[PDB]
Amino acid sequence: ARSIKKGPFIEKSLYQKVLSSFGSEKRVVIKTYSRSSTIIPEMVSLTISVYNGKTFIPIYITEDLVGHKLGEFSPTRIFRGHAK
Amino acid sequence: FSNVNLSMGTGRRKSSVARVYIREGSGNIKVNNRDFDSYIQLENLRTMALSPLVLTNTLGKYDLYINVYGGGISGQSGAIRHGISRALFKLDESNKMILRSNGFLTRDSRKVERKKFGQKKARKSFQFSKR
Amino acid sequence: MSRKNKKIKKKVFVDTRYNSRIVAKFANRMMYDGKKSISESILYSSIDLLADKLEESDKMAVFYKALDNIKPLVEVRSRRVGGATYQVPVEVREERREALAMKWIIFAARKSSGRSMKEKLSNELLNAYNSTGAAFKKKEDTHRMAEANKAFTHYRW
Amino acid sequence: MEPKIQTVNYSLNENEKNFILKKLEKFDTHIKKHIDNLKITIKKEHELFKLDAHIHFNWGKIIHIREDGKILLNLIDSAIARLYKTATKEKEKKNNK
Amino acid sequence: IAKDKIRVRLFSFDVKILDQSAESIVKAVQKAKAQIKGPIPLPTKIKKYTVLRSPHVNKKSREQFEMRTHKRLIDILEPTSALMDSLMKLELPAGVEVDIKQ
Amino acid sequence: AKKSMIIRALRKPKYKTRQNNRCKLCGRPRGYLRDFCMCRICFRKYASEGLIPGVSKSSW
Amino acid sequence: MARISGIDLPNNKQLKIALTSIYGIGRTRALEVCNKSSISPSKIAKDLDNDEVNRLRKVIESDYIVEGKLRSEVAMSIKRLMDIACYRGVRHRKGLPLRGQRTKTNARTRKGKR
RNA sequence: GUAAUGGUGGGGACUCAGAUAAGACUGCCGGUGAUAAGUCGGAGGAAGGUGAGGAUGACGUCAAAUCAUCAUGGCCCUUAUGUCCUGGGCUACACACGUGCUACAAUGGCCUGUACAAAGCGAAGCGAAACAGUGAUGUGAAGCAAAACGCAUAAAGCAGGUCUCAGUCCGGAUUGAAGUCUGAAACUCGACUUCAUGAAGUUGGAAUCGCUAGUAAUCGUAUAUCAGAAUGAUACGGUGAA
Ligand SMILES: [Zn+2]
């Protein structure tokens, strides 16, 4: 919920990686750590594996994912649906 | 420097201090450059305050001025009561016995305590619940 | 254990409307939350309403008599001798008389059904004046419960 | 109420856990209707076990028992027996009429 | 009012040496023959700290300390260059400190 | 405390939000006091011994 | 005995409060509705004629979204988060607090009765 | 000075601040008590029998707590159990217990006007007057290393209007949408605001806790840690009993 005057947050390394992917026709997967990066509308339609502390969880990004954050879709703790 | 105020006194309460000035007049009361009745809105506290005068049957012939600060409304009422008592004493020795009989010369040294570590308040303690 | 408690304050004989200690004590028992002004206003308005529901000039008179209609005489205090608990009757003291009375009126008025503040309490006050209602019922209940168990009256230690 | 078995620096074999339960059914014929809680704390500190049993009674009495031992089974036997006996003693205190 | 005044504030932890320095200064200036406004006592500043006692769990038990700062004030009328120079020249026992404004 | 942690606290972080104050006498990471730049236990010990000028016991 | 948006208001209720019975309406926006259709908020919801209530309904489905549509896209928003398999979506799926509250001792206003 | 401000010229009178002193010691009087120690009242007095509060915690006990603040004997690892960083985690749930907050509503909720405090804090910090904005806040910089200015127009209260015993104009948890501030970053895992959403909850069984007077009870304020984030903790005052 940042101020408007700050604009969205995207890490710089991730951002020029996104530009390089944008200028490449190959749709390579991007592995990342910056879970706090906002999905800027330009980087719609990519595939990113984000590190949840154990493994790189991959996502295809669609248009409606815009405005969220990358960590929102990489679960970090698992519950087996039962407390036993 | 007229010194029209024939006598002056001071009074204290919980955390309030009042300065009292006796003048000649019909008994009007001026507090903080405001009307006495409008300032002390509670008639109970006003009777509280004017009790020394009614006991010393002197109301209506001496005007009063009060400069009071600190404390709450009740504290200020008590402070001005004490100030009136001290001013009447400073005026006349005749009222000493009756004022001391009513206890108007000994002031309420009673004050709020301090909080103590390990306590929720001055005396309240945290819940034990042993079972 | 170290008896003969220090002399009570007793200095609050309310110098506001009647120069009477009993009204002050009743207002104090009325208090919630530390709100003396609210209690004083409610009590004054309610006794005024009572005095004009009974249409007399002297409000002290009717208030005092409605109190004295509830002030009890003998109450039950429990002792126990030889592993046997006995509910011995004992004569109350006057201060405890006002206390029990005021407590009973206050509890009944608060727990009654009413529209408003002085409404509830004035209604209860005239019920007491007429010797009927929850407060008078409780008083007579205590009275003749103590009387129904007067056999143990020789245990007054 | 039903008893609360806590442990520190140790791991509960199911054998010893239901051993504790089997020693505790002695209460639910005589004492259960008189107590608020019954806690049993096991600790393993100096190559030995330290047991603390604790009971609260409905009339304001509190019973505590602390013991040490070497073998968990023996320690539990002795400590639970002592606890049950003291609880019976307090119940009789009060019911002596 | 006054053409100018020298406002000098004396700060200390210790009342005794603070006072001692106060009369030292007042004597030093009356030697220079200047009119003086009285050494006027400012409110003492008390900073209370509450700390735990045990190095571990015990929380209900603690201990309280203060830092106390005592402050006096001197006003000097009709500032003189020699007077200000002498005030700056004065040596002073440790524990009492001076602040000067023209 | 851990001397390496003391030294890293002393050094300059990537930004101040990365650095936390420590009692540089004992390196305790917390219980810190800014007025004295040291932890509650060091403060208590040395103030009790009188090594901290101006700090005496408080009667309230 | 007027009906607005399918909800007909209790006539005994002070109308500025009566409109709050309409879903999507709270105290404040009821206040704008009153002072925006130019009806005294103190007037009861019984003494109301027909032209002015046509005015109120004009206001209501002119400037506001009310129970039907409001329910519609609140359910739409929930399902949009829920199908997209986000943290909040699967949280809605399970029935557990969303904003990050304790979910071990004090989460059973969402978890339900024990 | 028309304000709002002792604001201005003035003034030591008062409060006040803080140094130095006096004062309360059963001192005195009566009764009682073994001519005692003591004891119950009385006078004087602001203070009477330790005035009130705090500090001050004997020999020892529980092999009570702490090697995880430090110090330390022995044992243990030495590209490791050490250390630099990225991310996760300490915030995980069918559950059980302990400590608090807010309530369940009429000694009340909401709307408008008005009144009275103390103790604290400010240097990368306080940040005013005003304007924009329903609001969180934003632009600006006066003044200030501060009994000089700022935080900061305290809240219960009082004077009016409204609500009518209704799961309610009570309750504000829960969620949806859009915002505010902090910092490089706040999705898991920050606080706050606006709008809607309006659940459990009808004073709570056995059982149990706190409190003898400015005390319980309640209402706000300040501080410590802190870039940011308290219902906890520390401290301050208002009303004020039984
Ligand atoms: Zn330290």
PDB file of C-alpha atoms (C1' of nucleotides) in Angstrom, chain B residues 1 8-10 12-17 19 21 32 34 39 41-42 45 68-76 86 96 100 105-131, chain H residues 6 10-16 44-47 51-56 97-101 114-118 155-159 206-218 231-241:
ATOM      1  CA  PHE B   1      -0.056  50.276  43.351  1.00  0.00           C
ATOM      2  CA  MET B   8      -4.381  38.425  50.353  1.00  0.00           C
ATOM      3  CA  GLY B   9      -4.110  34.683  50.834  1.00  0.00           C
ATOM      4  CA  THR B  10      -3.096  31.433  49.189  1.00  0.00           C
ATOM      5  CA  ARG B  12      -3.710  24.546  47.799  1.00  0.00           C
ATOM      6  CA  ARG B  13      -5.412  21.249  46.975  1.00  0.00           C
ATOM      7  CA  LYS B  14      -4.580  17.994  45.153  1.00  0.00           C
ATOM      8  CA  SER B  15      -2.486  19.742  42.524  1.00  0.00           C
ATOM      9  CA  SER B  16      -4.138  23.181  42.313  1.00  0.00           C
ATOM     10  CA  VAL B  17      -3.108  26.561  43.706  1.00  0.00           C
ATOM     11  CA  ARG B  19      -4.547  33.202  45.158  1.00  0.00           C
ATOM     12  CA  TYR B  21      -7.707  38.928  47.205  1.00  0.00           C
ATOM     13  CA  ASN B  32      -9.657  34.087  36.208  1.00  0.00           C
ATOM     14  CA  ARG B  34     -14.518  35.325  34.426  1.00  0.00           C
ATOM     15  CA  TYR B  39     -16.504  29.394  35.765  1.00  0.00           C
ATOM     16  CA  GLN B  41     -20.356  25.366  36.602  1.00  0.00           C
ATOM     17  CA  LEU B  42     -21.370  22.932  39.347  1.00  0.00           C
ATOM     18  CA  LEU B  45     -18.789  22.994  43.954  1.00  0.00           C
ATOM     19  CA  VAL B  68      -6.399  29.722  40.360  1.00  0.00           C
ATOM     20  CA  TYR B  69      -4.581  27.146  38.256  1.00  0.00           C
ATOM     21  CA  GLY B  70      -3.672  23.475  38.303  1.00  0.00           C
ATOM     22  CA  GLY B  71      -5.809  20.550  39.377  1.00  0.00           C
ATOM     23  CA  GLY B  72      -9.299  19.674  38.231  1.00  0.00           C
ATOM     24  CA  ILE B  73     -12.578  21.421  38.921  1.00  0.00           C
ATOM     25  CA  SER B  74     -13.010  19.868  42.368  1.00  0.00           C
ATOM     26  CA  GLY B  75      -9.374  20.529  43.210  1.00  0.00           C
ATOM     27  CA  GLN B  76      -9.726  24.179  42.254  1.00  0.00           C
ATOM     28  CA  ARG B  86      -6.621  31.785  54.966  1.00  0.00           C
ATOM     29  CA  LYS B  96      -9.734  31.690  63.908  1.00  0.00           C
ATOM     30  CA  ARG B 100     -10.320  25.804  62.978  1.00  0.00           C
ATOM     31  CA  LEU B 105      -7.110  25.965  58.302  1.00  0.00           C
ATOM     32  CA  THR B 106      -5.607  22.469  58.046  1.00  0.00           C
ATOM     33  CA  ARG B 107      -5.390  21.616  54.372  1.00  0.00           C
ATOM     34  CA  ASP B 108      -5.778  18.242  52.716  1.00  0.00           C
ATOM     35  CA  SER B 109      -2.161  17.102  52.454  1.00  0.00           C
ATOM     36  CA  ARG B 110      -3.721  13.965  50.971  1.00  0.00           C
ATOM     37  CA  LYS B 111      -2.390  13.641  47.423  1.00  0.00           C
ATOM     38  CA  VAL B 112      -2.291  11.022  44.686  1.00  0.00           C
ATOM     39  CA  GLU B 113       0.200   8.200  45.201  1.00  0.00           C
ATOM     40  CA  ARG B 114       2.876   7.107  42.747  1.00  0.00           C
ATOM     41  CA  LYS B 115       2.768   3.933  40.711  1.00  0.00           C
ATOM     42  CA  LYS B 116       5.078   1.163  41.905  1.00  0.00           C
ATOM     43  CA  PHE B 117       6.873  -1.362  39.730  1.00  0.00           C
ATOM     44  CA  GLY B 118       5.249  -4.767  39.797  1.00  0.00           C
ATOM     45  CA  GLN B 119       1.865  -3.105  40.365  1.00  0.00           C
ATOM     46  CA  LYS B 120      -0.807  -2.113  37.875  1.00  0.00           C
ATOM     47  CA  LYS B 121      -1.405   1.017  39.959  1.00  0.00           C
ATOM     48  CA  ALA B 122      -0.412   2.478  43.312  1.00  0.00           C
ATOM     49  CA  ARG B 123      -1.933  -0.476  45.168  1.00  0.00           C
ATOM     50  CA  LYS B 124      -3.577  -2.795  42.636  1.00  0.00           C
ATOM     51  CA  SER B 125      -1.475  -5.855  41.829  1.00  0.00           C
ATOM     52  CA  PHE B 126      -1.471  -8.257  38.917  1.00  0.00           C
ATOM     53  CA  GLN B 127      -3.838 -11.212  38.996  1.00  0.00           C
ATOM     54  CA  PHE B 128      -2.603 -14.331  40.803  1.00  0.00           C
ATOM     55  CA  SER B 129      -5.096 -17.072  39.819  1.00  0.00           C
ATOM     56  CA  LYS B 130      -3.589 -20.011  41.669  1.00  0.00           C
ATOM     57  CA  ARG B 131      -5.271 -23.343  40.914  1.00  0.00           C
TER      58      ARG B 131
ATOM     59  C1'   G H   6       2.020  38.979  30.721  1.00  0.00           C
ATOM     60  C1'   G H  10       6.378  48.066  33.716  1.00  0.00           C
ATOM     61  C1'   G H  11       6.393  45.683  39.174  1.00  0.00           C
ATOM     62  C1'   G H  12       8.863  41.669  44.013  1.00  0.00           C
ATOM     63  C1'   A H  13       3.440  41.922  45.989  1.00  0.00           C
ATOM     64  C1'   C H  14       1.916  36.521  45.244  1.00  0.00           C
ATOM     65  C1'   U H  15       2.542  31.687  43.207  1.00  0.00           C
ATOM     66  C1'   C H  16       6.675  29.345  41.768  1.00  0.00           C
ATOM     67  C1'   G H  44      -1.016  23.649  70.802  1.00  0.00           C
ATOM     68  C1'   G H  45      -0.149  22.964  65.807  1.00  0.00           C
ATOM     69  C1'   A H  46       0.196  22.460  58.393  1.00  0.00           C
ATOM     70  C1'   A H  47       1.752  17.877  60.210  1.00  0.00           C
ATOM     71  C1'   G H  51       2.340  11.935  59.341  1.00  0.00           C
ATOM     72  C1'   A H  52       1.876   9.285  53.832  1.00  0.00           C
ATOM     73  C1'   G H  53       4.921   6.838  50.112  1.00  0.00           C
ATOM     74  C1'   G H  54       9.719   5.003  48.534  1.00  0.00           C
ATOM     75  C1'   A H  55      14.664   3.366  49.319  1.00  0.00           C
ATOM     76  C1'   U H  56      16.823  -0.100  52.851  1.00  0.00           C
ATOM     77  C1'   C H  97      -4.228 -23.530  29.934  1.00  0.00           C
ATOM     78  C1'   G H  98      -2.337 -18.493  31.858  1.00  0.00           C
ATOM     79  C1'   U H  99      -1.891 -12.889  31.327  1.00  0.00           C
ATOM     80  C1'   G H 100      -4.640  -8.283  29.128  1.00  0.00           C
ATOM     81  C1'   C H 101      -7.863  -5.182  25.913  1.00  0.00           C
ATOM     82  C1'   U H 114     -17.931  25.141  25.962  1.00  0.00           C
ATOM     83  C1'   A H 115     -14.268  24.348  30.788  1.00  0.00           C
ATOM     84  C1'   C H 116     -10.285  22.582  34.059  1.00  0.00           C
ATOM     85  C1'   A H 117      -4.148  19.218  34.526  1.00  0.00           C
ATOM     86  C1'   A H 118       0.431  17.115  35.866  1.00  0.00           C
ATOM     87  C1'   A H 155     -10.341  13.035  28.177  1.00  0.00           C
ATOM     88  C1'   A H 156     -14.247  11.785  31.529  1.00  0.00           C
ATOM     89  C1'   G H 157     -17.242  16.691  32.757  1.00  0.00           C
ATOM     90  C1'   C H 158     -20.829  20.493  31.614  1.00  0.00           C
ATOM     91  C1'   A H 159     -24.897  22.992  28.362  1.00  0.00           C
ATOM     92  C1'   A H 206     -17.656 -25.267  39.278  1.00  0.00           C
ATOM     93  C1'   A H 207     -13.760 -22.403  40.713  1.00  0.00           C
ATOM     94  C1'   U H 208     -10.827 -18.014  41.498  1.00  0.00           C
ATOM     95  C1'   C H 209      -8.136 -12.778  41.805  1.00  0.00           C
ATOM     96  C1'   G H 210      -7.206  -7.555  43.376  1.00  0.00           C
ATOM     97  C1'   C H 211      -8.138  -3.645  47.105  1.00  0.00           C
ATOM     98  C1'   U H 212      -8.512  -0.283  53.891  1.00  0.00           C
ATOM     99  C1'   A H 213      -8.342   6.403  51.214  1.00  0.00           C
ATOM    100  C1'   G H 214      -6.706   9.995  47.254  1.00  0.00           C
ATOM    101  C1'   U H 215      -7.176   3.478  47.978  1.00  0.00           C
ATOM    102  C1'   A H 216     -10.390   0.609  44.609  1.00  0.00           C
ATOM    103  C1'   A H 217     -13.227   2.086  40.041  1.00  0.00           C
ATOM    104  C1'   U H 218     -12.877   4.694  35.542  1.00  0.00           C
ATOM    105  C1'   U H 231      -4.275  -3.232  24.614  1.00  0.00           C
ATOM    106  C1'   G H 232       2.362  -4.954  27.210  1.00  0.00           C
ATOM    107  C1'   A H 233       5.952  -2.299  30.614  1.00  0.00           C
ATOM    108  C1'   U H 234       7.446   2.411  33.303  1.00  0.00           C
ATOM    109  C1'   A H 235       5.651   7.013  34.964  1.00  0.00           C
ATOM    110  C1'   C H 236       1.902  11.447  35.419  1.00  0.00           C
ATOM    111  C1'   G H 237      -2.623  13.837  36.452  1.00  0.00           C
ATOM    112  C1'   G H 238      -8.499  14.321  36.385  1.00  0.00           C
ATOM    113  C1'   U H 239     -13.112  12.523  38.841  1.00  0.00           C
ATOM    114  C1'   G H 240     -13.555   9.574  43.198  1.00  0.00           C
ATOM    115  C1'   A H 241     -16.279   5.888  46.748  1.00  0.00           C
TER     116        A H 241
END
